[PDB]
Ligand binder design. Structure first.
Ligand code: PLP
Ligand code: CL
Ligand code: NA
Ligand code: NA
Ligand code: NA
Length: 496
């Protein structure tokens, strides 16, 4: 068959593109997300996959979803992504604990799961540009206060045919977060601290992406913008791979036989990680339940329990900051599927979220919604969970992982479900060491660097390269600009 998988915008039934086009374009001009309109046929033979390398599972899954790329293009992307940047050749090892399995997604460059897709996105982009006969360098603009900034920089660093400029809020990040970015190496990477309202920074990036005069200047200088934000399909599809890999590891170790259903509990922010597990189920992965774990910012928990998405609520900075959200960006893709892949109806709900601050899901596919469960954990519950898993399993979870393991305990209690369950472990405790060390030791008032040293003494786990010697690493980025000067600084840097 010569058919390719059609990606459509969730807000325009006529905006259809191939996988390579969706990745290079990133954002749909209509405001929607590029989303697969059908699910590809994938032969999940665990008799073979139980012995497959991570890269072999990636080739099977990525071939199915990114089907306008050749086998040789995908091999190039997989081999360049899943290399020595990872601190174990397993890439995403599954660890067996007393009452759960933890899928460790923190073995990449920045010890956080966003490395899984950001290690490969740059190669998808440069390969897509060449496939479309473009001779332009791709310029990524990223405005974020989360771990995405460091993961994006580390993924694009020294990738030929790419340049990345990351904007972060000055005094809006921890000292350990700031140093991770300002010590980042790579001549094609630049990090700029923004003085002022950081909402303006995000607005200014969108303005630049839609600026027709600026686009003409980039074209003339053999440049083009792309986006590596939460809604790029190239950041979601590589996440499908590790759900299939986790299942393969359960079969390989004799924990399950192929065909048995497993559950996945996912610490959720913008929803792409748990949506990737949903896409894994759609291509045949035996999934019993997808458990959406939230922190005190529980708009998603309220949505799954009432079908009302209401963003008019207090916002809290928590100990699981990557999940501090009001608008879960990728939930829109699930809304689209819940409505039978209907862009008009999806647009209506998204327009209601913007004008009314809320929407209610009605006339949806119950088979899809019934796959999801949801609970949230408080900050105290997060700390109590890091302490309990340390006591029971001699294993230290980061706070995001602990929100998920605490939510799994709540899910088990409320439903009595005994299905084997995998926790998606989204960061190393070395990335958020203060809450982890204080939770297991009872200590208080530790600095980030004091907690790093104590975590090594307590766990016996080697300090990952991302935070090893970070206190004395050379500062390569020392730029702070006002939000209103971002575009002039970008134009001057690009020689426009
Ligand atoms: C980004 C992030 C999350 C949330 O992931 P989504 O796919 O956006 O739901 C959770 N934990 C950590 C550590 C993260 O960096
Ligand atoms: Cl610069
Ligand atoms: Na590389
Ligand atoms: Na069993
Ligand atoms: Na299948």
């Amino acid at each position: 068959n010569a058919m390719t998988l059609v990606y459509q915008s969730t807000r325009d039934a006529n905006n259809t593109v191939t996988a390579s086009q969706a990745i290079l374009q990133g954002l749909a001009t209509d405001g929607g997300l590029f989303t697969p309109d059908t699910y590809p046929k994938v032969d999940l033979n665990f008799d073979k996959l139980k012995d497959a390398s991570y890269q072999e599972v990636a080739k099977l899954v990525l071939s199915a979803f990114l089907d306008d790329f050749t086998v040789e293009e995908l091999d190039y992307c997989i081999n360049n992504a899943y290399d020595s940047k990872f601190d174990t050749p397993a890439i995403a090892p599954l660890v067996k604990l007393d009452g759960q399995y933890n899928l460790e997604l923190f073995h990449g460059s920045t010890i956080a799961f966003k490395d899984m897709a950001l290690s490969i996105l740059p190669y998808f982009m440069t390969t897509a540009a060449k496939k479309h006969g473009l001779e332009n360098k791709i310029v990524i603009l990223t405005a974020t206060s989360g771990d995405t900034g460091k993961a994006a920089m580390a993924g694009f660093a020294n990738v030929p045919g790419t340049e990345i400029i990351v904007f972060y809020p000055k005094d809006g990040v921890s000292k350990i977060q700031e140093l991770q970015m300002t010590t980042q190496t790579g001549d094609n990477t630049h990090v700029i601290a923004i003085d002022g309202n950081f909402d303006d920074a995000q607005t200014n990036v969108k303005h630049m992406f839609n600026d027709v005069a600026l686009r003409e200047k980039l074209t003339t200088n053999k440049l083009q913008f792309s986006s590596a934000n939460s809604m790029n399909i190239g950041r979601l599809v590589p996440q499908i791979v590790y759900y299939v890999y986790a299942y393969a590891q359960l079969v390989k170790t004799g924990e399950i036989v192929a065909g048995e259903k497993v559950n996945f509990t996912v610490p959720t922010g913008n929803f792409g990680n748990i949506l990737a597990a949903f896409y894994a189920k759609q291509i045949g992965l035996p999934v019993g339940k997808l458990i959406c774990a939230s922190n005190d910012n529980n708009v998603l928990t309220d949505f799954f329990k009432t079908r009302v998405y209401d963003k008019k609520r207090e916002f809290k900075v928590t100990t699981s900051p990557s999940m501090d959200i009001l608008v879960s960006s990728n939930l829109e893709r699930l809304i689209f599927h819940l409505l039978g892949n209907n862009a008009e109806k999806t647009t209506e709900l998204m327009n209601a979220l913007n004008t009314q601050g809320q929407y209610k899901l009605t006339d949806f596919d119950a088979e899809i919604l019934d796959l999801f469960a949801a609970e949230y954990a408080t900050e105290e519950e997060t700390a109590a969970e890091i302490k309990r898993v340390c006591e029971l399993d001699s294993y230290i979870e980061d706070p995001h992982t602990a929100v998920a393991s605490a939510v799994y305990k709540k899910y088990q209690s409320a439903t009595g479900d005994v299905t084997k369950t995998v926790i998606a472990s989204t960061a190393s405790p070395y990335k958020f060491p203060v809450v982890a060390v204080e939770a297991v030791t009872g200590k208080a008032g530790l600095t980030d660097f004091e907690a790093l040293a104590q975590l090594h003494e307590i766990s016996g786990v080697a300090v990952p390269p991302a935070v090893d010697g970070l206190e004395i690493a050379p500062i390569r980025h020392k730029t702070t600009v006002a939000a209103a000067d971002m575009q002039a600084a970008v134009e001057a840097y690009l020689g426009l």
